[PDB]
């Protein structure tokens, strides 16, 4: 097909955990969906202690934004590496076929840009990440990863083939960081990316993250930035981890329908308490809220969640159901 | 519904790996199932070396007991924290909906008790664990976790919808402990829980357990406490890990039907050699024994199993089948 | 049945990643399939630095060869431990039932041999490994593991029950090694296996591999030993990990049909980007190539892949499809 005959639509991405506007069931035929991302290397404070790292980002955020298209659309990405950056970057889409997911075609020095097109031939949520030859995990574990959702053209389906329609969607990107430590266990600091590289590699080779965070920082999805829902709403949470396994869990809830490895032609797993998203994967979980209050959404290695940062909150509005749960006798001394 | 109109049944729990009496197919309508657990903080010897830790337990054991109910029963738990304990505790049921699984409603100081009720709306095996705000992984990794099984009212089913009926059930709780180590690699010891806390946190943050055990100690499910079966018996092994991934395997056997993530509305995986139970999950495996002798049941990270403690035994009685396996030429020099 | 009435066929195994000749759909009735393996303890250089370890091998390779039979064939293995070796060895087949998978029946000192027969009653890919009582993980993590494929007699099937036929098969064995390190982080060296044992155990207990490799060494499946395919060919990649989780991913491709836990009576997962093979398991992924060029096949913990060794290449021949992917604007300064 002459791709020039297809509709084009442009999207300006939004910052995670929010997701750009889209339609679950495709309202048009196949399209070329145009996205632009600008790489930004920047300092980021990642913890309550004030630890500051040199992050490598797509569009200024960790994770990079969620892109949403439909099966057999074309994704056309304009990738810009401004001359204010220092490093070489590129992009690999796990949704794409060929050329290392695009990485072989998108190497951009500071001051350069490129435009890649690929056909989104498989439905699912997928990781995308930077992957410059010879320094792949350094870029990924500096925050340079996000996800893309390729919806079936007729939307999501349950294990029986019936429609599933979400009311709200959130994108949780989970990031393992490896801040180098000295003999004393203290964080080390670096003056240039080149002076950082070897100790960054050494720290990565411990296979022990110093931080594991949602949305780029300890506590990022809490407080005024807690996720929200109302009782009775259907919520899809897309969760990615570009480098390391995670095991998401909604404390006080479930995954009613879970694609743990993220690919929508498969039936979902039902009624999950916790699910395994392998490193290098995006998964998706659908839940209908049944109770109000605070929930925690965590990686259920609870050390990873509550000591290293992999925990966020939902604040849910509505009526309490005493049939589902009640305090029969409140805590007391007798 | 007026819950007061429903039958009540009381259960006194039994110590793992055994499971209180129950019926697979529900012989009554929905019920309120009453359980009582008493929290016990106690010293436990966890290895052959004599390493002694301060454990935090439900009902005196690591893991806590297995509770068994049916879908849409109500679980009513009386949780007692005697004044002989030091710490605040609570309980979160992954089977439950709302209030952080119950944790927000069950905070009990020493000298207090509480009664929680919830509706068991989803069938499966699920983790339960203590989760006091701000010190969650310390309690969990001190042994304060167990599991609950919510059976479908018509019992278990295979991948074709045919009944599966177990003859025996065992509950294996797998516990990761993080005993703090000094520069020399020697275990450190502590005089009060408060003096222990920071080094407990530091040890947890290594993400490297010092011990990984079944039923609370190295070798606990061996010798006079080996699990048992006869050739031809159908055995369900429920396995939980509240904090960290495991990969169970029956050495010399299989999981004929496995719910690796524990939720019975899903078809089981067939013929598994090894399966992944994510941290924060309970799974269940069904096997019909076909050969007698000793089996080892392990986490198949074999270092975790044979060096760190995650190994137990079955002793199986009956007739050897030489069709299935035989020594054609016994080991010899020729 | 009188097994003596069945056909016998002998196989001389081939070195991974290649696989001995076989037929997907069984062209005969059940057979006794005869294999011979000779244990070889040998020095192996495992990295670009020249690090040399004392490996323990089946048939001279890491991994050991892939054996291929059909469901309800009998496997008859002659296992030889020549008197040029130092250690006791045996073999445990995860495909087999009874006697610890064969390990209880196959203990051979140097100078001894044995012949084991078992019935391959379950279809799938399965791990086999050495497992001498008391020193199991040392042998496994010294390279003494491989895999066996038990094909359904009517070959592989998709999620709808339609045939899947591969054109090429490769076997990737992934090995975690634990070379002991001193305080400085330098590798230690040893003069005898007995003098090595305690520090080998200590290194294993870190749960942090020093090396994670395909086919026995960093870069083994690259260069002149890259895997190969043509556009349009259907390739099955069998992947095993006897001790530790992995998460395979074809960079630039997918797993079109994946049995992540390796058992062919289950429907495959479709369209996977990345999949979790638990330690102690073999999995299999089927892909039809659609683009030419270089691919990397990796464990998608990218530190594990690109720093520790778990990366190989495919070189794929054929026509580039610009519909599927194209550079619209090559990298440039504007
Ligand atoms: O609209 N994306 O930068
Ligand atoms: O980029 N990770 O959330
Ligand atoms: O910001 N110049 O590419
Ligand atoms: O900028 N190099 O493709
Ligand atoms: O169920 N909270 O870990
Ligand atoms: O929306 N619930 O009151
Ligand atoms: O909760 N009232 O005892
Ligand atoms: O009967 N449970 O303590
Ligand atoms: O509590 N864990 O077995
Ligand atoms: O043991 N008094 O709660
Ligand atoms: O005892 N406090 O809920
Ligand atoms: O199959 N035993 O590890
Ligand atoms: O029960 N078997 O002889
Ligand atoms: O096993 N008899 O040589
Ligand atoms: O033919 N196997 O050594
Ligand atoms: O033996 N492992 O590739
Ligand atoms: O090589 N003698 O067994
Ligand atoms: O060589 N011992 O079975
Ligand atoms: O998609 N390469 O990591
Ligand atoms: O085989 N492809 O030109
Ligand atoms: O790729 N041509 O600008
Ligand atoms: Cu980059
Ligand atoms: Cu990738
Ligand atoms: Cu507690
Ligand atoms: Cu929990
Ligand atoms: Cu051996
Ligand atoms: Cu094994």
Tokens of A49: 């202690």
Domain boundary at A125, A152, A179, which? Answer: A152
Query: In whole angstroms, how far apart are CA C328 and each of A102, A106, A115, C323?
Result: 12, 10, 5, 11
Interface A:C, Cβ pairs < 8 A: 164
From the list A115, A124, A244, the residue facing C328 with the nearest CB is: A115
Tokens of B142: 């001190």
- DSSP state letters, B232-276: T-EEEEEEEESSS-B-EEEET--EEEEETT--TTSPPEEEES---
Query: How big is chain C, counted in residues?
Result: 334
Distance C116 CA to ligand 15 centre (A): 15
**Dist. CA B120–CA B99, nearest whole Å:** 14
Backbone angles phi, psi at A139, to 5 degrees: -70, -45
Other chains touching B, judged by 3 or more CB pairs under 8 Å: A, C
User: From the CB of residue A207, how many other CB atoms can be counted at a distance below 10 Å?
Assistant: 21
Cα C191 from chain centre: 29
Ligand with minimal distance to A39 CA = 22
Strand order in the sheet with C92-93: C66-70, C145-151, C124-129, C92-93
The distance of C72 to chain A (nearest Cα, Å) reads: 30
Nearest CA among C132, C57, C66, C59 for reference residue C100: C132
Q: Answer whether residue B258 is part of any domain.
A: yes
Nearest CA among C97, C70, C103 for reference residue B324: C97
Q: What is the DSSP-derived secondary structure letter of residue A226?
A: -
Beta bridge partners of C237: C170, C285
**Dist. CA B191–CA B210, nearest whole Å:** 20
Domain boundary at C152, C172, C196, which? Answer: C152
Tokens of B218: 């190295």
Q: What is the DSSP-derived secondary structure letter of residue A288?
A: E
Half-sphere exposure of C1 (CA within 13 A, CB side): 14
Query: Are A45 and A74 members of one domain?
Result: yes
Resolution of the structure in the document, Å:
1.1
Query: In whole angstroms, how far apart are CA C136 and each of B301, B306, C204?
Result: 11, 7, 12
Query: Are C240 and C128 members of one domain?
Result: no
Decide: C166 and C235 in contact? Cβ < 8 Å: yes
- Our count of domains for chain C comes to 2
Decide: C148 and C95 in contact? Cβ < 8 Å: yes
Q: Answer whether residue B329 is part of any domain.
A: no
Domain boundary at C96, C126, C152, which? Answer: C152
Residue B52 neighbours by CB under 8 Å, 6+ apart: B43, B44, B45, B46
Beta bridge partners of B317: B230
Query: Are A22 and A131 members of one domain?
Result: yes
User: From the CB of residue B49, how many other CB atoms can be counted at a distance below 10 Å?
Assistant: 9
Nearest CA among C63, C112, C107 for reference residue C89: C107
Nearest CA among B79, B131, B119 for reference residue B95: B119
Q: Answer whether residue A293 is part of any domain.
A: yes
Decide: B212 and B310 in contact? Cβ < 8 Å: yes
The distance of C17 to chain A (nearest Cα, Å) reads: 22
Q: Is-catalytic flag, C51?
A: no
Question: Do the chains contact at A243 and C303, CB–CB below 8 Å?
Answer: yes
**Dist. CA B176–CA B198, nearest whole Å:** 18
Whether omega for the bond prior to residue C63 falls within 30 degrees of 0, making it cis, is yes
From the list A105, A136, A207, the residue facing C327 with the nearest CB is: A105
**Dist. CA A294–CA A288, nearest whole Å:** 15
Whether omega for the bond prior to residue C218 falls within 30 degrees of 0, making it cis, is no
Question: Do the chains contact at A114 and C294, CB–CB below 8 Å?
Answer: no
* H or E element that contains C95: none
Which of B76, B92, B176, B304 is flagged as catalytic? B92
**Dist. CA B146–CA B63, nearest whole Å:** 5
Query: Are B83 and B158 members of one domain?
Result: no
Neighbours of ion ligand 24 (CB under 5 A): B 56, 89, 130, 139, 144
Classify B211 as helix, strand or coil.
strand
**Dist. CA B254–CA B232, nearest whole Å:** 14
Q: What is the DSSP-derived secondary structure letter of residue C105?
A: G
Q: Answer whether residue A145 is part of any domain.
A: yes
The sign one gets for the Cα dihedral C9, C14, C17, C20 is: negative
Query: How big is chain A, counted in residues?
Result: 334
Decide: A63 and A171 in contact? Cβ < 8 Å: yes
Ligand 12 atom nearest to CA at C92: 1
Query: Are B196 and B92 members of one domain?
Result: no
> How do strand B269-272 and strand B255-259 relate by DSSP bridges?
antiparallel
Q: Is-catalytic flag, B94?
A: yes
Query: Are B18 and B110 members of one domain?
Result: yes
Query: Are C17 and C124 members of one domain?
Result: yes
Classify B181 as helix, strand or coil.
strand
Residue C323 neighbours by CB under 8 Å, 6+ apart: A1, A3, A119
Query: Are C223 and C209 members of one domain?
Result: yes
Residue C99 neighbours by CB under 8 Å, 6+ apart: B252, B291, B293, B325, C105
**Dist. CA B97–CA A264, nearest whole Å:** 26
Among protein residues, the one with the nearest Cα to ligand 17's atom 1 is: C82
Tokens of C231: 């556009």
Tokens of C21: 């000749």
- DSSP state letters, B82-113: -TT--S-B--EETTS-SGGGGGGG--B-TTEE
Tokens of C229: 């395919």
**Dist. CA B276–CA A258, nearest whole Å:** 16
**Dist. CA A245–CA C229, nearest whole Å:** 30
Binding-site positions of B for Cu cation = 89, 94, 129-130, 139, 144, 300
Whether omega for the bond prior to residue A143 falls within 30 degrees of 0, making it cis, is no
Query: In whole angstroms, how far apart are CA A214 and each of A38, A62, A298?
Result: 21, 8, 9
Question: Do the chains contact at B261 and A275, CB–CB below 8 Å?
Answer: yes
**Dist. CA A275–CA B263, nearest whole Å:** 11
Which of C22, C54, C70, C129 is flagged as catalytic? C129
Q: Is B109 in the pocket of ligand 11 (CB under 6 A)?
A: yes
Backbone angles phi, psi at B55, to 5 degrees: -90, 155
Query: In whole angstroms, how far apart are CA C73 and each of C5, C26, C266, C278?
Result: 13, 10, 20, 26
Half-sphere exposure of B271 (CA within 13 A, CB side): 23
Tokens of B122: 């989803």
Alpha helices in chain C (DSSP H): 136-140, 193-205, 302-306
Phi-psi map region of C71: left, alpha, beta (phi>0 left; psi -120 to 50 alpha)? beta
**Dist. CA C81–CA B331, nearest whole Å:** 10
Q: Is-catalytic flag, A225?
A: no
Classify B314 as helix, strand or coil.
strand
Q: Is C109 in the pocket of ligand 18 (CB under 6 A)?
A: yes
Q: Is-catalytic flag, C92?
A: yes
Which residue of C lies nearest to A268 if distances are taken between CA atoms? C269
Q: Is-catalytic flag, C273?
A: yes
**Dist. CA C122–CA A227, nearest whole Å:** 46
Query: In whole angstroms, how far apart are CA C280 and each of B209, C34, C285?
Result: 19, 24, 17
For residue A188, give the CATH number of its domain: 2.60.40.420
Q: Answer whether residue C82 is part of any domain.
A: yes
Q: Answer whether residue B326 is part of any domain.
A: no
Query: Are C301 and C197 members of one domain?
Result: yes
Partners of residue C280 in chain B, C-beta under 8 Å: 247, 249, 273-274, 300-302
> Which method resolved this structure?
X-ray
**Dist. CA A249–CA B278, nearest whole Å:** 10
Classify C313 as helix, strand or coil.
strand
Query: Are B190 and B305 members of one domain?
Result: yes
Q: Tokens 């003096």 identify what position? A: B195
Query: Are B231 and B247 members of one domain?
Result: yes
Q: Is-catalytic flag, A249?
A: yes
**Dist. CA B197–CA C98, nearest whole Å:** 46
Query: In whole angstroms, how far apart are CA B266 and each of A234, B259, B333, C280?
Result: 21, 8, 52, 24
Q: Answer whether residue A34 is part of any domain.
A: yes
Decide: C97 and B291 in contact? Cβ < 8 Å: yes
Half-sphere exposure of A292 (CA within 13 A, CB side): 7
Question: Do the chains contact at A263 and C247, CB–CB below 8 Å?
Answer: no
Q: What is the extent of the structural domain holding A124?
A: 1-152
**Dist. CA A156–CA A152, nearest whole Å:** 7
Query: Are C125 and C264 members of one domain?
Result: no
**Dist. CA B201–CA C44, nearest whole Å:** 40
Q: Answer whether residue A91 is part of any domain.
A: yes
Tokens of C218: 């960093």
**Dist. CA C271–CA A123, nearest whole Å:** 8
**Dist. CA C278–CA A1, nearest whole Å:** 42
User: From the CB of residue B1, how many other CB atoms can be counted at a distance below 10 Å?
Assistant: 8
Nearest CA among B89, B82, B75, B91 for reference residue B35: B75
Which residue of B lies nearest to A319 if distances are taken between CA atoms? B98
> How do strand A8-11 and strand A92-93 relate by DSSP bridges?
unpaired
Cα A150 from chain centre: 14
Q: What is the DSSP-derived secondary structure letter of residue A28?
A: S
Decide: A243 and A279 in contact? Cβ < 8 Å: yes
The distance of B96 to chain A (nearest Cα, Å) reads: 7
């Amino acid at each position: 097909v002459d791709i020039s005959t297809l509709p084009r639509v442009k999207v300006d991405l939004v910052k995670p955990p929010f997701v750009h506007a889209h339609d679950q069931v495709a309202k048009t035929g196949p399209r070329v969906v145009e996205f632009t991302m600008t790489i930004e290397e920047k300092k980021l404070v990642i913890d309550r202690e004030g630890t500051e790292i040199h992050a490598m980002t797509f569009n200024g955020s960790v994770p990079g934004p969620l892109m949403v298209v439909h099966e057999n659309d074309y994704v056309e990405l304009r990738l810009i590496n401004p001359d204010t950056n220092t490093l070489l970057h590129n992009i690999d889409f796990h949704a794409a076929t060929g050329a290392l997911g695009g990485g072989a075609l998108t190497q951009v020095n500071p001051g350069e840009e490129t435009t890649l097109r690929f056909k989104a031939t498989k439905p699912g949520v997928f990781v995308y990440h930077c992957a410059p030859e010879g320094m792949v995990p350094w870029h990924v574990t500096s925050g340079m990863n996000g996800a893309i959702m390729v919806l079936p053209r007729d939307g999501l389906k349950d294990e029986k083939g019936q429609p599933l329609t979400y009311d709200k969607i959130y994108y949780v990107g989970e990031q393992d960081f490896y801040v180098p430590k000295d003999e004393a266990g203290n964080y080390k600091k670096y003056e240039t990316p080149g002076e950082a590289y070897e100790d960054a590699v050494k720290a990565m080779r411990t296979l022990t993250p110093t931080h594991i965070v949602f949305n780029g920082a300890v506590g990022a999805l809490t407080g005024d930035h807690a996720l929200t829902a109302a009782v009775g709403e259907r919520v899809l949470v897309v969760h990615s981890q570009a480098n390391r396994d995670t095991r998401p869990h909604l404390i006080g809830g479930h995954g009613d329908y879970v694609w743990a490895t993220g690919k929508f032609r498969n039936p979902p797993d039902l009624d999950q308490e916790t699910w395994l998203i392998p490193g290098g994967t995006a998964g998706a979980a659908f839940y209908t809220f049944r109770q109000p209050g605070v929930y925690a959404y965590v990686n259920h290695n609870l050390i990873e969640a509550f000591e290293l940062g992999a925990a966020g909150h939902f604040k849910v509005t509505g009526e309490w159901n005493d049939d589902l749960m009640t305090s029969v006798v409140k805590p007391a001394s007798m």
